[PDB]
Curated annotation (Swiss-Prot), chains A, C, F:
Record protein name field: Carboxysome shell protein CcmK1
Every BMC domain range: 2-88
Record comment regarding domains: The tight homohexamer forms a pore with an opening of about 5.0 Angstroms in diameter which is positively charged. Sulfate ions are bound in one crystal form in both the pore and between hexamers which may represent metabolite flux. The C-terminal flexible tail, which is the most variable part of CcmK proteins, seems to be involved in packing of hexamers in layers.
Principal location class: other
Subunit structure: Homohexamer. Interacts with full-length CcmM. Forms mixed heterohexamers of all possible stoichiometries with CcmK2, which might form dodecamers. Only very weak interactions with CcmK3 and CcmK4 were seen. Interacts with CcmN and CcmO in the carboxysome.
One GO-annotated biological process of the protein: photosynthesis
First-to-last residue of the parent protein present: 3 to 91 of 111
Iron listed as a keyword: no
Amino acid sequence: IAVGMIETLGFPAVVEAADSMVKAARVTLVGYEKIGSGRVTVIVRGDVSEVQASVTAGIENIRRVNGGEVLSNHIIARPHENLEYVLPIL
Amino acid sequence: IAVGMIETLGFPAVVEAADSMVKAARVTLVGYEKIGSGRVTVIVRGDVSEVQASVTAGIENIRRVNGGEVLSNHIIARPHENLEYVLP
Amino acid sequence: IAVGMIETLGFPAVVEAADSMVKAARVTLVGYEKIGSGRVTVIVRGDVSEVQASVTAGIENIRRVNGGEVLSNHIIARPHENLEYVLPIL
Amino acid sequence: IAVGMIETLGFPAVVEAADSMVKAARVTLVGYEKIGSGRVTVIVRGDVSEVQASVTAGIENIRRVNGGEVLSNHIIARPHENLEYVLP
Amino acid sequence: IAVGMIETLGFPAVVEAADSMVKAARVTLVGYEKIGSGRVTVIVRGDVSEVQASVTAGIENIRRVNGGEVLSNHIIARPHENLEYVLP
Amino acid sequence: IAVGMIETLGFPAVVEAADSMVKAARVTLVGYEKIGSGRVTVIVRGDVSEVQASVTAGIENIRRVNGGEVLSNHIIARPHENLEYVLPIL
């Protein structure tokens, strides 16, 4: 099951990404990650095509947020088992 | 009901944000979030029109803080059941 | 009861602010807040006129500190009850 | 056996780094380290040639992340017994 | 008695700060504070003239650290009873 | 017993420093310190001459690291007892 994530400069933007993502498709919102410098990441899990739907919707909708910026985004279709317990993507 | 947040550079302005929001309308201050880089967020819940009125008041009144700066603001009208896994 | 706060770039400066504040008037020094980027805030509680006396003395006296800067400052005379338990101003 | 790490600006790229490493060769993802300033590191163990293969794959594939950036990469061939006091 | 602090960019210089302060005069190292952004502070207690002598020694000797930088220094002569709510 | 330390911009570099240090001489590697802005410090303890051997090797070998930088470094030959329990150098 695929993992999708959107990284924002700012917190209100990550919440809108999160919201848009879980409304747009069949994905489980599996938390968010803070790494400093105002960089925050929301992460979801589901079918690869649902996760694409989610990420696209998430990026689009930070245009709605006043002062929002997407810094990065990515999808992995077939994430290796080892990552589940090292990284906070579960 | 909706959720309303204002992010600021600097803590004193975020306290004004919070104070003005909760005084302006029928919303509950439910959240304070720090993400580093001096970026702080204040989060409220209540009817979408009460949330609209509070965020507006918060952004205006931060102009009254010496050294205050708003970085971002946002409202979400019908927040998803499971959005609580990113709120504090 | 009113809340006053002074935000500094730097730690030695926030301690001088804190000291000046609590000497200048009848206020309780109710801790300090760190938010990253070297931004730190001291907070006090008391009568509105005491808090004013305190913040004025606090800002003045970071001139004494070598390398000190005030980044922001603010006072709220009648802070809403809700903020007491969400924000670290108690 | 060796240790292999790739540091990135931004978390999504560091997940790709990890994924690509572990898929490329016979290495075990053993570590994820944050030092602030948006700087994140991913750490693997295994034979030096497997490690070499993994790190190389990780650096290439981060080019495929929208907003991805590699900050630093390194391999240590015969890491000291007591290096575990800085690994996570 | 007074309180003496030296803030530095970088941890190694703050260790020198500390070492020099405590060796220079009759003061006790009571505090080490991190506020992010690489900013670190070292805090001492003792007579105002011992504190004056220590801070001075600390500022001089950081010049001897490769990559050392002082960001700010300060002394408070008669620190308030309740200043301990901001000291570590 | 002397204390030596190397500060890096970046984590992979601090590990190479740490490794080189403990291979080059009789020193105990006594952890590392993070202070923000991507600034990390490795710390060791041993004879003054061993610590010098270690720091020299440490600084040299971050040339091996792709993207590595040393920001600062220092040695104290006879560190004051008071520092042991205030600072994380033990």
